[PDB]
Write an enzyme that holds these catalytic residues in place. Structure first.
Site, PDB file in Angstrom:
ATOM      1  N   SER A  54       1.705  -2.751  -3.612  1.00  0.00           N
ATOM      2  CA  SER A  54       0.928  -1.594  -4.115  1.00  0.00           C
ATOM      3  C   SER A  54       0.589  -1.787  -5.595  1.00  0.00           C
ATOM      4  O   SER A  54       1.389  -2.410  -6.308  1.00  0.00           O
ATOM      5  CB  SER A  54       1.697  -0.339  -3.884  1.00  0.00           C
ATOM      6  OG  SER A  54       2.303  -0.355  -2.603  1.00  0.00           O
ATOM      7  N   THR A 100       0.853  -1.209   0.000  1.00  0.00           N
ATOM      8  CA  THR A 100       0.000   0.000   0.000  1.00  0.00           C
ATOM      9  C   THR A 100       0.875   1.240   0.000  1.00  0.00           C
ATOM     10  O   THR A 100       1.787   1.296   0.823  1.00  0.00           O
ATOM     11  CB  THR A 100      -0.692   0.191   1.348  1.00  0.00           C
ATOM     12  OG1 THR A 100      -0.169  -0.782   2.251  1.00  0.00           O
ATOM     13  CG2 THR A 100      -2.197   0.121   1.258  1.00  0.00           C
ATOM     14  N   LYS A 131      -8.899   3.542  -0.073  1.00  0.00           N
ATOM     15  CA  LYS A 131      -8.052   3.667   1.135  1.00  0.00           C
ATOM     16  C   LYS A 131      -8.188   5.074   1.724  1.00  0.00           C
ATOM     17  O   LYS A 131      -7.574   5.328   2.762  1.00  0.00           O
ATOM     18  CB  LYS A 131      -6.621   3.231   0.820  1.00  0.00           C
ATOM     19  CG  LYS A 131      -6.515   1.889   0.111  1.00  0.00           C
ATOM     20  CD  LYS A 131      -5.101   1.410  -0.042  1.00  0.00           C
ATOM     21  CE  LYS A 131      -4.982   0.227  -0.976  1.00  0.00           C
ATOM     22  NZ  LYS A 131      -5.989  -0.812  -0.669  1.00  0.00           N
ATOM     23  N   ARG A 169      -5.267  -1.202  -4.347  1.00  0.00           N
ATOM     24  CA  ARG A 169      -5.127  -2.681  -4.463  1.00  0.00           C
ATOM     25  C   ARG A 169      -5.077  -3.331  -3.082  1.00  0.00           C
ATOM     26  O   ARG A 169      -4.304  -2.839  -2.246  1.00  0.00           O
ATOM     27  CB  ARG A 169      -3.833  -3.044  -5.190  1.00  0.00           C
ATOM     28  CG  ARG A 169      -3.478  -4.521  -5.148  1.00  0.00           C
ATOM     29  CD  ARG A 169      -2.171  -4.818  -5.854  1.00  0.00           C
ATOM     30  NE  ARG A 169      -2.298  -4.792  -7.301  1.00  0.00           N
ATOM     31  CZ  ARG A 169      -1.292  -4.990  -8.141  1.00  0.00           C
ATOM     32  NH1 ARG A 169      -0.078  -5.225  -7.675  1.00  0.00           N
ATOM     33  NH2 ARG A 169      -1.502  -4.950  -9.442  1.00  0.00           N
ATOM     34  N   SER A 203       3.517  -0.296   2.522  1.00  0.00           N
ATOM     35  CA  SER A 203       4.634  -1.067   1.919  1.00  0.00           C
ATOM     36  C   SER A 203       5.414  -0.208   0.920  1.00  0.00           C
ATOM     37  O   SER A 203       6.652  -0.293   0.923  1.00  0.00           O
ATOM     38  CB  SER A 203       4.111  -2.304   1.266  1.00  0.00           C
ATOM     39  OG  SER A 203       3.460  -1.989   0.048  1.00  0.00           O
ATOM     40  N   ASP A 212       6.572  -1.408  -5.894  1.00  0.00           N
ATOM     41  CA  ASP A 212       6.223  -2.358  -4.804  1.00  0.00           C
ATOM     42  C   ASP A 212       5.245  -3.387  -5.371  1.00  0.00           C
ATOM     43  O   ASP A 212       4.298  -2.978  -6.064  1.00  0.00           O
ATOM     44  CB  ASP A 212       5.639  -1.655  -3.579  1.00  0.00           C
ATOM     45  CG  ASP A 212       5.736  -2.481  -2.312  1.00  0.00           C
ATOM     46  OD1 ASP A 212       4.862  -3.338  -2.108  1.00  0.00           O
ATOM     47  OD2 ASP A 212       6.689  -2.258  -1.546  1.00  0.00           O
ATOM     48  N   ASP A 224      -3.099   4.251  -3.280  1.00  0.00           N
ATOM     49  CA  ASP A 224      -3.275   3.305  -4.415  1.00  0.00           C
ATOM     50  C   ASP A 224      -4.558   2.519  -4.177  1.00  0.00           C
ATOM     51  O   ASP A 224      -5.176   2.732  -3.125  1.00  0.00           O
ATOM     52  CB  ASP A 224      -2.121   2.313  -4.514  1.00  0.00           C
ATOM     53  CG  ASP A 224      -2.038   1.348  -3.345  1.00  0.00           C
ATOM     54  OD1 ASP A 224      -2.039   1.820  -2.194  1.00  0.00           O
ATOM     55  OD2 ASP A 224      -1.982   0.132  -3.598  1.00  0.00           O
ATOM     56  N   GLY A 241      -2.707  -1.202   6.162  1.00  0.00           N
ATOM     57  CA  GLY A 241      -2.573  -2.174   7.260  1.00  0.00           C
ATOM     58  C   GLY A 241      -3.645  -3.227   7.119  1.00  0.00           C
ATOM     59  O   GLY A 241      -4.057  -3.475   5.980  1.00  0.00           O
TER      60      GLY A 241
END
Ligand SMILES: CC(C)C[C@@H](C=O)NC(=O)[C@H](CC(C)C)NC(=O)[C@H](CC(C)C)NC(=O)OCc1ccccc1
Lengths: 250, 239, 220, 204, 238, 240, 234, 240
Positions: C169, C1, C33, C19, C129, C166, C17, C47
């Site tokens: 993400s 994330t 989010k 996902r 992340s 990442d 993002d 999280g």
């Protein structure tokens, strides 16, 4: 403190419970509620009260409540106590369905609420629940059943009974005109209209002034349909037609 | 919760509330119990059928366990709680100390619950006096009576309810050595007591007799009528 | 994330993002989010998805109740103090890392709330992340006092670094811009990556499957 | 894995005016099958169905606990539960036990009560809702189901096409998972009727 | 009238009536006398018998090796306080490994007695005690009233006809410090003799003598053991 | 009447009668006087000895609540012992929680709040005591406070409680308390008590005197016997 | 020091069977300042009369019309402090429903839950019954809903109702109008008129507080808007 | 109209009137004191009369003005002990608001919270309603200076100018005329209007020591209690 305390549960020197008797009087002041049992179906019809013109009437029948898919009740007495009891009844039915995955039989529901009603009389120095309600339901064990619960917690399985303002008059008409072992919900509905006309001082039994709900078993599903005002109107006219026929005979 | 003593000793030394609770039993419908040599018998009166009302819901005789059965006179609601509480104890007695429940134990339990309500703060005493009739493992038939206060006395025959005194006097005078015997005669003795009951309706009186080696059986109304006919035939013989 | 926030002259732009990945497979291709704490305050959560969604709702409910009693727009200090005290009590068991941004009477504020109950107030904060990757964009390209467009471009660029650098993400970029006079949420602000068209038809003609038993129930 | 002890697979899909829910019928402990008729899709009302896959104790407890709550809501508020409302109610049930999670991952696939727009949702054991417009798969063979679903779904499908697409996707995917299988039941819900079918499957 | 019912209620004259009524309970009780000397403390008590066949109820109850309590009031109340005092001495021995100072115990006894006399519902304790003890400070005698007010007294008497005992103790109080144990008991039994109706007389059955001192742990001498203390007495001056 | 039964009842006039009746009990108590001198506070208590057999120190009405604080009590002695215990405990909690001796202003307020709580409820009776707390600190200076059964705490240069409260305060007002040295103040306190004793209304009394000040180094202490007795001699000589 | 307190109900059944304390609480509602609620087809209008005794009091500080939630508002007749306790309780209940169901509380549901709190006081010990009757209004599922909860806890749904001094005259005045075919809320004028019929010296923007719930939501009308409606009020 | 114990406990009466709450209002007047507050364009001022009956009481201890928070101050009219308890509860609630919410309590909210505590005392028997009225002064951004009063019944409102105590019908009317033509008072004018209103209603023409004035200003948000000398300069200015 003791000086600011109401006994509530203490026994009378006579041996009756004073508060419970007083609660019974409140049920007498409340509007008429009548139940008639027929082999095809069990029906509960009650008289709407305080029918002011401005009321919305959006509660889908204030007097009638559906406790479970197969059971229903109508209550006469303090409205606040009724709302507490009607919610409690719905929970007891659901808790049984989770523990044993089958619908609560009927007498079990009546006894379970009755146990709560007696407990208030038994202890806690608290006001008794001044409500009396008629339960109409179908079970696999004993088929269509009708029950009445008093504020005391005592209950009965009357095929026909009335718990409203003119109960004594309604019961007398019901005993004379109820035909034991003869069903036909239509005959029971006609008997209900006749009892309602006697119980209600206002003449013409206006459709708005009365509420009728019929519990019948169709395709093994148990349907608690509530009669529409138009259905109530045709029934009142049929009662008038019978009254007119008696006038022709005179 | 509420914590004040509902029952307190009065200057005369009597717990007034317990006497008032007994008055409720006096207003209760009459109940008659006798013990046969092998068949225990108990009966109830004042059914007061309203025709519309259903008899099964109003029955005042119940089986707490296969071994024991009970009849109640007094406030109907209080009895339903005491009967269900006894049913729990009888099954609970089997889960602990595995074995059946002796009739005396169940009467002590019902008596202790009734005494505790008098000796508890905030709770009104139970208004029910009960006749508990059952057969023990030995097979001796046992009948006991529980007061609202909470005292249990074994009784070969007794009655509680409205006009209990008249029936009690009739039972002691009409009691026969050998307990009548023949089973039908023991049932007849209750039927005679039922005739002694003020209503004297016949069909109105309903009685259930336990074989004491099997399970409680409610008399069929037609079967009860035949027993009433036997009492009527005895009345014709007396004439 | 990747969840990124910037304080620009007038207000705060919050970007995340879209996902959600269970294990190493993408369960959700469009998970929001950015959450509505209040009209003037919004929060970004990275999280446990359950913890982030539930923690945000309780604060939003308490702030809406506070605003009704207070009669005035809620302060970001209130939301942050409420969030930090709840997360500290749970001692890290509630795993939500939250970027809280809102414009209050005092002015535009941005806070980073960590699961153990520690919060840092900073001009630019990134959590998740892909957070390290977005912070590289922020350190290199952040200038104090920026126009709304310049901040929006910076937040989108920070999220894009996380999405493309990442594995965790990914998906579309969502940006919410909060200012004293206006609040703008663009749920599909940018769609950097699109699924390719399917070259071959794989539709299965009726009668290509076998029915051992069938029933029809009429409805109403 | 507690999740794979009893096994299981559930898939739901969206059509033009219809929503389809499917599940494998096998019930087993470890590698030993016990019964082939376990119910994993429990109806939550007319036009709404919920499918639970996971530890079988949880699959039964959650459906039973949800029905207790739904029945009280339906009595207290006359209207039938909206599909979105049910998803929130399940998420509240799942989160209440977040510290010790029920090992189930429910998939809800029902039409709306008054308007009839298809709703498909999937939830985690902890309780995070995932509304989707294509398909939701929540089973031990989740990856296999996802691959077939991604490659077979089409945007607008008449009920017949939705049934073939869900049928092939569950049947082909369940075949490559050892702990799930033994038959598939497809309940396709359209406003006029609810159609339940059992598909020929490899019973191996 | 209305004010008399509860401890919580205060009279318009600002006196708590239930406390006064509880004080009366001590007065309707057997007379007990306590005296102290430089090294020893004696607590003579007059046991009263319900019936000739019935044994006299025991008045002096041992609390610890260094402390003994006489009772002049409702017996069941005394048992509750006596149980508390035994427990308090035991805890002091357990944690501090030393005898509890007698004055400190009297202080704890008062705090326990005050809480009922205040809170609603709870009733004032109704027992009057005459604690006797030996500690580093020395011999001690302490009177406790149902009011929860302790009083440290060189001599004392509580219960019915106690006034006569107080007068004798007061007249001879000077002699008490410089006397042997036998004399201290002898003055104390003489004090009980005044409480006794003139027709009745002190006998081994009706008198209990308890002594605690520097070399003596509390001993409830009674029956035959009481006889040497009774012997040597001058005839009652009737 | 009928509004005086509980302390949870306000009279139609607008007063809690039960609290007033409690204050009446304080009036019934013998006088205890406290005076704030230039360096410290001195309290003297008139305790009449009901019985000669009591060994002295019996029912002592002066209590060392904390190392730097002492209290003089007038009212039901039993209620006072309980209050001193609340005060001793409140002081101990402060030293443990904050690390320093409690300021007297705080101790009087904290004890007074407890006294106030009893008046609000029907369940608990109002307190029957009106104790005075006095403390000397180099940092904050000598302070004297008196808390009555209502719960009202007021700082007093000089104060009296009990039957002779009016007579004692009138005699106290004449004294120059602000400048008088504490050792000099002790003889004055003895004189005020001897004058207000009443002589025949009450039986012979024992004078209990307490000293908190620079001489006592900030520790509440009973007056040394040599400092006392001479003070009694002056008081007896002054009255005659 | 007395902890929870009295556990015995202060309300007990009369020999007649009517609870006396609930009747006394009803008297406070009748004695209360006039409050009028009218439901128009587009939206409900809640109007109450706030006359501060002196110019010294700031009318803006306290609002008799309060927003329980975005779509639900409450007006009260009776004791003021008790209404504030109910209003806080109702807001908590509405938020708890939103947290559990993620949908704004249905208007009827809030009334039943608020009423259940009011009933609890009547049965429970120590507590006196509430002295306030509320006229909750809401706009759920488009249709506007107006309900009234009495101190006993009985709830009734009213197209129009009035409570407070001269409530009976207000009910008759509404009965004369209240055709209920008013698609627009011109009932804001009728509500101002019903309060005006029983109004004392004058009706001003400060004197009357009006809150309107429409499809948009419950908004308390601005003092300027009340002046505009009070102006040219027929 | 009386039914049962309607006048003896906080239960409803025929006519729906809480007699016990009405008796509580009389309690505020029972203490022989009055307090006045005025809100100016830039400042809010609270004034009270301090009466020291005997010289021995320390003047500093006898204060009816207390600081709830650095920016909020209050004047208490009623029984002293009950008022001191309401002061502690208000001080605690403000500390909690700051800790839980991160900003100092708005003066509007402090009044509602203390009022909400008061309403429960009326609702549940076993707790007496309380006999103290509190007026709160504070500067709130976007609201300017604000003065609020909490009744024993639990009523709360915002007040431009108000008074509580023995003589308040006169005080409100005297202020009401001044409020009608105030045209926004300056800081000196606000102190003058409050002092003059108290001077006329009491008809005392009091000297500076006899009264206490506490003021909160937009320029100096911190609540400040004026020293007697500062009060004197304002007092002479009105006298001229
Ligand atoms: C707001 C969130 C969607 C942010 C997102 C990315 O950080 N969170 C996540 O992706 C986290 C896992 C991550 C911490 C590795 N949650 C998830 O991946 C999924 C959500 C999808 C399956 C729908 N939730 C979940 O149940 O995680 C598994 C789990 C189970 C028990 C405890 C902790 C974690």
């Amino acid at each position: 403190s003791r000086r600011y305390d109401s006994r509530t549960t203490i026994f009378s020197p006579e041996g009756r419970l004073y508060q419970v008797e007083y609660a019974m009087e409140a049920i007498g002041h409340a509007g008429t509620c009548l139940g008639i049992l027929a082999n095809d179906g069990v029906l509960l019809a009650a008289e709407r009260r305080n029918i002011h013109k401005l009321l919305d009437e959006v509660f889908f029948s204030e007097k009638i409540y559906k406790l479970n898919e197969d059971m229903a009740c109508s209550v006469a007495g303090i409205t606040s106590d009724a709302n507490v009891l009607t919610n409690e009844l719905r929970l007891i039915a659901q808790r049984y369905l989770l523990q044993y995955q089958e619908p609560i039989p009927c007498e079990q529901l009546v006894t379970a609420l009755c146990d709560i009603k007696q407990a208030y009389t038994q202890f806690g120095g608290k006001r008794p629940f001044g409500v009396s309600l008629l339960y109409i339901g179908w079970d696999k064990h004993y088929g269509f059943q009708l029950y009445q619960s008093d504020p005391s917690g005592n209950y009965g399985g009357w095929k026909a009974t009335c718990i409203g303002n003119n109960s004594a008059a309604a019961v007398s008409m019901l005993k004379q005109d109820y035909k034991e072992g003869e069903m036909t919900l239509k005959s029971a509905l006609a008997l209900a209209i006749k009892v309602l006309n006697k119980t209600m001082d206002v003449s013409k039994l206006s459709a708005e002034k009365v509420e009728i709900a019929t519990l019948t078993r169709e395709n093994g599903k148990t349907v608690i349909r509530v009669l529409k005002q138009k259905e109530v109107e045709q029934l009142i006219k049929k009662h008038e037609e019978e009254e007119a026929k008696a006038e022709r005979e005179k | 919760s509420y914590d004040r003593a509902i029952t307190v000793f009065s200057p005369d030394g009597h717990l007034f509330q317990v006497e008032y609770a007994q008055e409720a039993v006096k207003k209760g419908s009459t109940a008659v119990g006798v013990r046969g040599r092998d068949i225990v018998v108990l009966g109830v009166e004042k059914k007061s059928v309203a025709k519309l009302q259903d008899e099964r819901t109003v029955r005042k005789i119940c089986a707490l366990d296969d071994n024991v059965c009970m009849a109640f006179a007094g406030l109907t609601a209080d009895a339903r709680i005491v009967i269900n509480r006894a049913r729990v104890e009888c099954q609970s007695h089997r889960l602990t100390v595995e074995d059946p429940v002796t009739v005396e134990y169940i009467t002590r339990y019902i008596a202790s619950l009734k005494q505790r309500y008098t000796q508890s703060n905030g709770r009104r005493p139970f208004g029910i006096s009960a006749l508990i009739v059952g057969f023990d493992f030995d097979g001796t038939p046992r009948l006991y009576q529980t007061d609202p206060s909470g005292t249990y006395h074994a009784w070969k025959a007794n009655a509680i309810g409205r006009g209990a005194k008249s029936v009690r006097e009739f039972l002691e005078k009409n009691y026969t050595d050998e307990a009548i015997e023949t089973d039908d005669l023991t049932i007849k003795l209750v039927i005679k007591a039922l005739l002694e009951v003020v209503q004297s309706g016949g069909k109105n009186i309903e009685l259930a007799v336990m074989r004491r080696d099997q399970s409680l059986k409610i008399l069929n109304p037609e079967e009860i009528e035949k027993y009433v006919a036997e009492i009527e035939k005895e009345k014709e013989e007396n004439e | 994330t990747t969840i990124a926030g910037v304080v620009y002259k007038d207000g705060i732009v919050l970007g995340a993002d879209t996902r959600a990945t269970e294990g190493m497979v993408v369960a959700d291709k469009n998970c929001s989010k950015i959450h509505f704490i209040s009209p003037n305050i919004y929060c970004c959560g990275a999280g446990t998805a359950a913890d982030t969604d539930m923690t945000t709702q309780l604060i939003s409910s308490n702030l809406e109740l506070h605003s009704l009693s207070t009669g005035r727009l809620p302060r970001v200090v209130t939301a942050n103090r409420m969030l930090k005290q709840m997360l500290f009590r749970y001692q890290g068991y509630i795993g939500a890392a939250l970027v809280l941004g809102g414009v209050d009477v005092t002015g535009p504020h941005l806070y980073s709330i960590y699961p153990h109950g520690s919060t840092d107030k900073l001009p630019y904060v990134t959590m998740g992340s892909g957070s390290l990757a977005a912070m590289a964009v922020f350190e290199d390209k952040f200038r104090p006092d920026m126009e709304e467009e310049e901040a929006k471009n910076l937040v989108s660029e920070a999220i894009a670094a996380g999405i493309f650098n990442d594995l965790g993400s990914g998906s579309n970029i969502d940006l919410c811009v909060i200012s004293k006079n206006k609040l703008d949420f663009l749920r599909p602000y940018t769609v950097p990556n699109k699924k390719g068209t399917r070259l071959g038809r794989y539709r299965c003609e009726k009668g290509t499957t076998a029915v051992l038993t069938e029933k029809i129930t009429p409805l109403e | 894995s507690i999740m794979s002890y009893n096994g299981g697979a559930v898939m739901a899909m969206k059509g033009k005016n219809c929503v389809a829910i499917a599940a494998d019928r096998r019930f087993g402990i470890q590698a030993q099958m016990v019964t082939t008729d376990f119910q994993k899709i429990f109806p939550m009302g007319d036009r709404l169905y919920i499918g639970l896959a996971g530890l079988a104790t949880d699959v039964q407890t959650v459906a039973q606990r949800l029905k207790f709550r739904l029945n009280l809501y339906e009595l207290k508020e006359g209207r039938q539960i909206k599909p979105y409302t049910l998803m929130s109610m399940v998420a509240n049930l799942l989160y209440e036990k977040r510290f010790g999670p029920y090992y189930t991952e429910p998939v809800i696939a029902g039409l709306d009560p008054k308007t009839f727009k298809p709703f498909i949702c999937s939830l985690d054991l902890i309780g995070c809702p995932m509304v989707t417009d294509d398909f939701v798969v929540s089973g031990t063979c989740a990856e296999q189901m996802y691959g077939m679903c991604e490659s077979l779904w089409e945007p607008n499908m008449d009920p017949d096409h939705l049934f073939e697409t869900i049928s092939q996707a569950m049947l082909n995917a369940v075949d490559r998972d050892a702990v799930s299988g033994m038959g598939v039941i497809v309940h396709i819900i359209e406003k006029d009727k609810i159609t339940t079918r059992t598909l020929k499957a490899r019973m191996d | 009238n209305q004010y008399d019912n509860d401890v919580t209620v205060w009279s318009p004259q600002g006196r708590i009536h239930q406390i006064e009524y509880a004080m009366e309970a001590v007065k309707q009780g057997s007379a007990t006398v306590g005296l102290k000397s430089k090294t020893h403390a004696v607590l003579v008590a007059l046991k009263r018998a319900q019936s000739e066949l019935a044994a006299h109820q025991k008045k002096i109850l041992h609390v610890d090796n260094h402390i003994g309590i006489s009772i002049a009031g409702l017996t069941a109340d005394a048992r509750l306080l006596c149980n508390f005092m035994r427990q308090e001495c035991l805890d002091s021995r357990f944690v501090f490994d030393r005898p509890l100072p007698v004055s400190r115990l009297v202080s704890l006894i008062g705090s326990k007695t005050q809480i009922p006399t205040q809170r609603y519902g709870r009733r004032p304790y109704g027992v009057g005690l005459l604690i006797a003890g030996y500690d580093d400070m020395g011999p001690h005698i302490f009177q406790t009233c149902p009011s929860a007010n302790y009083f440290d007294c060189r001599a004392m008497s509580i219960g019915a006809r106690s006034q006569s005992a107080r007068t004798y103790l007061e007249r001879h109080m000077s002699e008490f410090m410089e006397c042997n144990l036998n004399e201290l008991v002898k003055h104390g039994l003489r004090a009980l003799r005044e409480t006794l109706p003139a027709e009745q007389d002190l006998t081994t059955k009706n008198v209990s003598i308890g002594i605690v001192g520097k070399d003596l742990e509390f001993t409830i001498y009674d029956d035959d053991d009481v006889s040497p203390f009774l012997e040597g007495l001058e005839e009652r001056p009737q | 009447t009928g509004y005086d039964l509980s302390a949870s009842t306000f009279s139609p006039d607008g007063r809690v009668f039960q609290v007033e009746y409690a204050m009446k009990a304080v009036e019934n108590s013998s006088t205890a006087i406290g005076i704030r001198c230039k360096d410290g506070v001195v309290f003297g208590v008139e305790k009449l000895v009901l019985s000669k057999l009591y060994e002295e120190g019996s029912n002592k009405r002066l209590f060392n609540v904390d190392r730097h604080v002492g209290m003089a009590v007038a009212g039901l002695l039993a209620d006072a012992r309980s209050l001193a215990d609340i005060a001793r405990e409140e002081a101990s909690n402060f030293r443990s929680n904050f690390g320093y001796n409690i300021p007297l202003k705080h101790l009087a307020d904290r004890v007074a709040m407890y006294v106030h709580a009893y008046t609000l409820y029907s369940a608990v009776r109002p307190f029957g005591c009106s104790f005075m707390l006095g403390s000397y600190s180099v940092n904050d200076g000598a302070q004297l406070y008196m808390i009555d059964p209502s719960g009202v705490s007021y700082g007093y240069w000089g104060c009296a409680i009990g039957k002779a409260r009016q007579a004692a305060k009138t005699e106290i007002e004449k004294l120059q308390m602000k400048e008088m040295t504490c050792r000099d103040i002790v003889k004055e306190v003895a004189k005020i008590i001897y004058i207000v004793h009443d002589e025949v209304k009450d039986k012979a009394f024992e004078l209990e005197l307490s000293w908190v000040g620079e001489l006592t180094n900030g520790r509440h202490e009973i007056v040394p016997k040599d400092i006392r007795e001479e003070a009694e001699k002056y008081a007896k000589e002054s009255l005659k | 020091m007395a902890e929870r307190g009295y556990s015995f109900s202060l309300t007990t059944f009369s020999p007649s069977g009517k609870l006396v304390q609930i009747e006394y609480a009803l008297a406070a509602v009748a004695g209360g300042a006039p409050s009028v609620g009218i439901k128009a087809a587009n939206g409900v209008v809640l109007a109450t009369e706030k006359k501060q005794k002196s110019i010294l009091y700031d009318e803006r500080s306290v609002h008799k019309v309060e927003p329980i939630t975005k779509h639900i508002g409450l007006v009260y007749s009776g004791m003021g402090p008790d209404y504030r306790v109910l209003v806080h309780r109702a807001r908590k209940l509405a938020q708890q429903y939103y947290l559990v169901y993620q949908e704004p509380i249905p208007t009827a549901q809030l009334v039943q839950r608020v009423a259940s709190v009011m009933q609890e006081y009547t049965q429970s010990g120590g507590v006196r019954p509430f002295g306030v009757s509320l006229l909750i209004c809401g706009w759920n599922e488009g249709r506007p809903y107006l309900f009234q909860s009495d101190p006993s806890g009985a709830y009734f749904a009213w197209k129009a109702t009035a409570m407070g001094k001269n409530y009976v005259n207000g009910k008759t005045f509404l009965e004369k109008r209240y055709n209920e075919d008013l698609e627009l809320e011109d009932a804001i004028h009728t509500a101002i008129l019903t309060l005006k019929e029983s109004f004392e010296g004058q009706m001003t923007e400060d004197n009357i507080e009006v809150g309107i719930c429409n499809e948009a939501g419950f908004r308390r009308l601005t003092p300027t808007e009340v002046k505009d409606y009070l102006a040219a009020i027929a | 109209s009386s039914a049962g114990f309607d006048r003896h406990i906080t239960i409803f009466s025929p006519e729906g009137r809480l007699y016990q709450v009405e008796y509580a209002f009389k309690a505020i007047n029972q203490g022989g004191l009055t307090s006045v507050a005025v809100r100016g364009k830039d400042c809010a001022v609270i004034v009270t009369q301090k009466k020291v009956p005997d010289k021995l009481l320390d003047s500093s201890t006898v204060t009816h003005l207390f600081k709830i928070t650095e920016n909020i101050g209050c004047v208490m009219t009623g029984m002293t002990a009950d008022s001191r308890s309401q002061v502690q509860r208000a001080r605690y609630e403000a500390a909690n608001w700051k800790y839980k919410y991160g900003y100092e309590i708005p003066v509007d909210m402090l009044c509602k919270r203390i009022a909400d505590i008061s309403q429960v005392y009326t609702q549940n028997a076993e707790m007496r309603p309380l006999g103290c009225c509190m007026i709160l002064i504070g500067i709130d951004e976007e609201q300017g200076p604000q003065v609020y009063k909490c009744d024993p019944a639990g009523y709360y409102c915002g007040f431009k100018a108000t008074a509580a105590g023995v003589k308040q019908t006169e005080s409100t009317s005297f202020l009401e005329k001044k409020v009608k033509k105030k045209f926004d008072w300056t800081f000196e004018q606000t102190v003058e209007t409050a002092i003059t209103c108290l001077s006329t209603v009491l008809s005392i023409d009091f000297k500076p020591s006899e009264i206490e004035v506490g003021v909160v200003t937009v320029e100096n948000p911190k609540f400040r209690i004026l020293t007697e000398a500062e009060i004197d300069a304002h007092l002479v200015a009105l006298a001229e």
